[PDB]
């Protein structure tokens, strides 16, 4: 029950490239799409749903932080837990990833858990 | 100031067959766009572009009086006009053949014509934009014997109390190496009033450094202006750019 749990996954040196806001099952939600800053790898998609999952209490803070990093376009580490969202159309459009953390990154390292 | 403009000199080596082509192809590309050259000094231009239009502005120059023709020359299209100004001197006295031109991104407030003491010389012509003056000249082809006199008449004219506030820059074909001009001026006791700005490479196929610039040293930020040789065009004279160094 922590962002830094080893059962979670992270992707370093990413830049938030897309932002979406909507509603599902009476619950406001947002999703972000991030890609490697250098152009490598495959894009990462994560979502946060307001009234759902164990990460529900951090919905507002994660949204404010996602918006911030999206505006600055700075290098970040994105933390997710896989296979959380279940609606097939929702997952197909976005992913099953729950956003659980965001850390700013410098040249050599990122300011977050491993 | 001189560094605020992109300045350039070029000796067309004009003829009845090549001149129009040189205006329409070479001169056009040097000038085109907002990044294009703002002030272009031109020598051996017996003719302006055929698409240039007389403004009908009667010019009374400072110095002496020879007829200077003002033209507009649209480097853009009909739906998007980029109008440049051309100041042309063709016929001198009974000897005629000046063939000097200055192209400008804006209309001259004043025009200058100065006659060096060497009576065999072509006059020196210039335009004034605000506190800046841009002049061109074309010394004689026998090793540029009047080049020093050309600089001297320019120096002495702008030293006048009324004229001292102006920054002036002279560029053209001196027909003499920059080294020797500095020696001539040194002999004329004028070597420190001005600074010669030349490219390191020859400007005429052959060949030596004949095309360069001279800036009055009292001109603010004059030491920023750098002479850089341009890739050759359709004459045996390389165009030379005078640009502000990065900062």
């Amino acid at each position: 029950e922590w962002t830094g749990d080893n059962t979670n996954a992270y992707y370093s040196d990413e830049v938030i490239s897309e932002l979406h806001v909507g509603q599902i099952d009476t619950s406001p939600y947002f999703c972000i799409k991030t890609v490697k800053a250098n152009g490598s790898g495959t894009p990462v998609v994560a979502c946060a749903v307001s009234k759902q999952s164990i990460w529900a209490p951090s919905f507002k803070e994660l949204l404010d932080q996602a918006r911030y990093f999206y505006s600055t376009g700075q290098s970040v580490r994105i933390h997710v837990q896989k296979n959380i969202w279940t609606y097939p159309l929702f997952v197909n459009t976005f992913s099953a990833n729950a956003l659980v953390g965001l850390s700013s990154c410098s040249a050599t390292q990122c300011f977050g858990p491993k | 100031n001189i560094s605020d403009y992109k300045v350039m000199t070029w000796n067309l080596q004009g003829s009845s067959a090549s001149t129009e082509s040189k205006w329409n192809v070479n001169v056009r590309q040097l000038l085109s766009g907002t990044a294009g050259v703002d002030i272009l000094m031109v020598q051996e231009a017996g003719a302006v572009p055929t698409s240039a239009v007389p403004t009908g502005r009667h010019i009374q120059p400072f110095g002496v009086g020879i007829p200077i023709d003002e033209y507009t020359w649209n480097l853009g299209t009909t739906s998007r006009q980029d109008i440049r100004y051309i100041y042309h001197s063709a016929i001198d006295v009974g000897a005629r053949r000046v063939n000097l031109a200055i192209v400008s991104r804006q209309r001259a407030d004043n025009v200058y014509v100065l006659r060096p003491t060497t009576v065999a010389s072509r006059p020196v012509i210039g335009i004034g934009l605000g506190n800046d003056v841009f002049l061109t000249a074309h010394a004689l082809a026998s090793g540029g014997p009047d080049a020093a006199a050309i600089v001297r008449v320019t120096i002495n004219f702008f030293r006048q109390p009324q004229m001292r506030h102006l920054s002036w820059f002279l560029a053209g074909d001196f027909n003499r190496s920059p080294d020797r001009l500095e020696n001539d001026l040194m002999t004329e006791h004028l070597e420190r009033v001005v600074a010669v700005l030349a490219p390191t490479e020859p400007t005429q196929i052959g060949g030596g450094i004949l095309d360069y610039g001279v800036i009055v040293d009292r001109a603010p930020y004059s030491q920023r202006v750098e002479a850089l040789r341009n890739p050759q065009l359709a004459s045996d004279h390389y165009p030379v750019a005078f640009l502000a160094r990065s900062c």
Partner: protein, 224 residues
């Protein structure tokens, strides 16, 4: 506007001799107002930023004086505006009719600057006086110090140009570019480094100001 101002660490006896020089030949207007062509960016802007606001000059000085790595002295130079000095708005307006767009960050930014731009270098003849800017480190107060008249100044009958900056480049429809700022949302073009410090015989160092991206800062204050 009849008079505008710049701030510089260069002493009056030098500025009165040389005036202020452009960084380069970059005419791009949007790159100038966002500060991208100024000393923190490509450092080649073909404009000099001035302000009509004395209080903005206090803010510029305060943004330098409040740094503990800064040790120099600052002056306010009073400049007579002429037809080569333009306000932002008529050029913002024009470029918009040419398919250009300025976002809310850029427009909030510009509004705070009281900014007039010079298309040419600024001559000693335009510079009427220098007033020293003095900083009381205890209070943060900035006050006028010694004032020095420039002898070479010409009290000509000129005023700022109310029209559109000439030779403006066309682009662009969309940018989303970094907005360089310092102090309390001051455009980076007001940095001491945003005029070319090529002063002969006067090899003094210019303090390098740091800049932050003003977009996220403005988004934060715009939020809520």
């Amino acid at each position: 506007v009849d008079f505008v101002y710049r701030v510089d660490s260069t002493p009056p006896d030098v500025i009165f001799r040389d005036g202020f020089s452009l960084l380069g030949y970059n005419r791009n207007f949007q790159q100038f107002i966002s500060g991208r062509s100024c000393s923190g960016g490509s450092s080649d802007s073909r404009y000099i930023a001035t302000t009509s606001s004395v209080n903005q000059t206090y803010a510029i000085a305060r943004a330098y004086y409040s740094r503990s790595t800064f040790k120099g002295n600052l002056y306010r130079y009073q400049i007579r505006a002429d037809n080569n000095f333009y306000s932002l708005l008529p050029s913002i307006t024009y470029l918009e009719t040419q398919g250009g767009h300025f976002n809310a960050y850029e427009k909030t930014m510009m509004r705070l600057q009281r900014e007039y731009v010079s298309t040419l270098s600024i001559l000693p003849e335009n510079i009427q006086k220098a007033v020293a800017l003095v900083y009381d480190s205890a209070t943060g107060l900035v006050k006028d110090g010694v004032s020095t008249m420039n002898a070479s100044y010409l009290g000509l009958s000129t005023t700022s140009n109310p029209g559109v900056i000439p030779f403006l480049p066309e682009p662009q429809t969309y940018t989303q570019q970094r907005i360089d700022a310092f102090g309390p949302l001051i455009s980076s073009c007001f940095s001491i480094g945003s005029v070319c410090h090529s002063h002969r015989g006067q090899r003094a160092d210019v303090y390098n100001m740091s800049f932050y991206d003003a977009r996220p800062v403005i988004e934060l204050i715009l939020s809520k």
